[PDB]
Amino acid sequence: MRTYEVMYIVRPNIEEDAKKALVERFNGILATEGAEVLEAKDWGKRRLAYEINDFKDGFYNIVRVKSDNNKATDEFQRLAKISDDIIRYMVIRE
Amino acid sequence: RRVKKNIENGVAHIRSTFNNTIVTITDEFGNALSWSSAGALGFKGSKKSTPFAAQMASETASKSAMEHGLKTVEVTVKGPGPGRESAIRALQSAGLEVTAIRDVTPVPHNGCRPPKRR
Amino acid sequence: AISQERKNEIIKEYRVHETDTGSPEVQIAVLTAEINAVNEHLRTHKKDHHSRRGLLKMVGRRRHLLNYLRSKDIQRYRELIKSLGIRR
Amino acid sequence: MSSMRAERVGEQMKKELMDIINNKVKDPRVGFITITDVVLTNDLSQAKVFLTVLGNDKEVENTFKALDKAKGFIKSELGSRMRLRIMPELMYEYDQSIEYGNKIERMIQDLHKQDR
Amino acid sequence: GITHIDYKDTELLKRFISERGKILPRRVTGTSAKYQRMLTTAIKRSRHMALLPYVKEE
RNA sequence: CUUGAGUGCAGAAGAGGAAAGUGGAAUUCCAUGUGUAGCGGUGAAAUGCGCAGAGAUAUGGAGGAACACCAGUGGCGAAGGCGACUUUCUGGUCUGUAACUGACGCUGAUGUGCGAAAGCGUGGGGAUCAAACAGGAUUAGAUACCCUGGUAGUCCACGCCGUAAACGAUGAGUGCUAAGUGUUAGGGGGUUUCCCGCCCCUUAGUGCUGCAGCUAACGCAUUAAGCACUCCGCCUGGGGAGUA
């Protein structure tokens, strides 16, 4: 039973509706396999220290989940890779 | 307007190897209009590396720089050069308004192996 | 590599008296569990030689404890050897 | 007292010396963007380094009082870098030719003044 | 006595960083080796999120 | 029987190992914008590229490799070796308690594994570097040192090879024998309101200086090359010879 804090960056170019759809879909796909979200927080607009590829900024938001060892990474490592609307992410432990 | 670009704020790109010095003057975004090199002005071999060659190349570059008009400029330092320490005073004495001095040393984060021998 | 809870239940069910934690039967049982876990890991991860060295040390410890048991009391050794199904 | 070999040793020692002095001598609080030139005896046991500093006559002194401590590190790394057998002792001296040459340009004014 | 360094608390990660954005050596900051290891881990993790610069001079 | 050994319980640190993914700098190359006559090289030169637009600057892209700061006379590992970050799997060690098994221990021929770099086989990849090779330079001569390129290789997967100045040139295990002073991971006590300070005590590493003692000397000295016991490996003048 391990807590996997994960934060991810969505580009500022998205619309508000698309942004909310992204956030809800990602929390849902994170927690749908057996994980249960303990805290989903929207850190919000915050200046980056480097242009990622060509975007100056992004949206920080944090999701904290506890599950088995292969419920958090499994869908991120695919979907975040294909989905170009995400540009940065990682998952940490306790 | 490429030839006669009227801008008083560009950036000064000097480059001084341990054998040669290349000086070029660009715009703020970095559009080159003129340059000077020790190899262009009769300096060969060792005399290219000597600091006064770099200073005089800086003078002859600045001449063409204000030929089209240029007042303020920022200096970027690339590589170890024996002529760079007096270059800033050379440009400022040439009739310039140097604002920011920045040393840009490309230091690789252990990307490629350096040549073993000299 | 066996989770603490699995360790506790193995020493629960291979115990000899209610307070016993370390004894040839309990140690051999938990060592067999760890050996099987590391064997599974090496089955999945072949070129992992440090873990295999640790597994060899575990196998040696278990074999030495088994020899001690067989020399000390034969009947409990004879009933233990088939409880986990080892030492054909 | 000089041979081509000493010249090559001086050039290749200058290239590495400038690198180390400006990229590895952290601890001395007075780091300075320096230029250098090095000469050696024919037997490569003695080497003279000539360099320039930016600052006043107390900042050159602070930088020198820092180079004096750092000489050990410089010699260690330099021997760890080059194939040369015997580490030459190193002393650091200002390149007075910079100011002298500048004074050398000064009387040029006098020649042009009287002829004008 | 913080006893835990978190990479989302950028104030502490800027207090122990250079004007070049590089990690300050333990001698300059005067911290402990254990907390130094935690600090460099946190700083690298923050750098991975573009939360801290790799090379800054402007 | 519990002292050695081991399992527990509470903790600790770690570039220990294998697999996948992610990131920045730098590199070469490609494309584009500006821009003209040079670039790089050396002691000096020369080879070569450059008007077909070079080098320089700015932007974008492709691919490979290794991870600047941290970085330490630091850490981990049996050795070789292991430094970007995240996750998964996994080995070892240390501290305190210690009720638990109750000598279950040490060494270890044969045997079986791991084993730097180079090298071999089948494939893949190939950015930098670079044996061989090509050219130039240097030289009384230069096949070399220097420069311009550059193949194998350096990288990955699976096999083979099984060697090193593989070194602490010090086999493993255990016990005893003055001290002083750093440093890594812990533990405990005291003081202080409070440790974020400090002092004292202690365990396990890792350094330096030094008694007794040993050594032919250099030197080692609680990490012994001292005092003892156990087991294994090896030596008996130099060359021939690591030869037949």
Numbering used by the authors:
A (entry chain f): 1 to 94
B (entry chain k): 10 to 127
C (entry chain o): 2 to 89
D (entry chain A): 1 to 116
E (entry chain r): 22 to 79
Please share text taken word for word from the publication where this structure appeared.
One such assembly factor involved in small ribosomal subunit maturation is the ribosomal binding factor A (RbfA). In general, RbfA is a small, compact, single-domain protein with a molecular weight of 13–15 kDa. RbfA proteins have a KH-domain-(type II)-like fold which is characteristic of RNA- and ssDNA-binding proteins. The RbfA facilitates the correct folding of the functional core of rRNA and is required for 30S maturation and translation initiation.
A reconstitution of the S. aureus 30S–RbfA complex was performed by mixing recombinant RbfA and mature 30S subunits, obtained by dissociation of the purified 70S ribosomes. The final reconstruction was performed to an overall resolution of 2.9 Å. Comparing the map of the 30S–RbfA complex with individual 30S subunit maps (EMD-23052, EMD-3624) revealed an extra density, which was assigned to RbfA. This density is located near the CDR between the head, neck, and central platform of the 30S. Therefore, RbfA causes the head to shift relative to the subunit body by displacing the neck. The 30S head moves up and back approximately 10–15 Å from the interface side. The 3′-end of 16S rRNA (in the mRNA exit channel) interacts with the hkh motif and the α1/β1 part of RbfA, and the β1/β2 loop is directed toward the cavity between the 30S neck (h28) and the h44-h45 linker. α3/β3 is inserted between two bends of rRNA (G1517 and G1541) and the outer side of α1 approaches the central platform (h23, h24) and S11. The RNA binding side of RbfA (hkh and α1/β1) holds the 3′-end of 16S rRNA (G1542-A1548) where A1543–C1545 interact with the AXG sequence motif (Ala70-Lys71-Gly72 in S. aureus RbfA) of the KH-domain. The amino acid residues Ser97-Asp115 of RbfA bound to 30S form a helix-like structure, which interacts with the S7 protein.
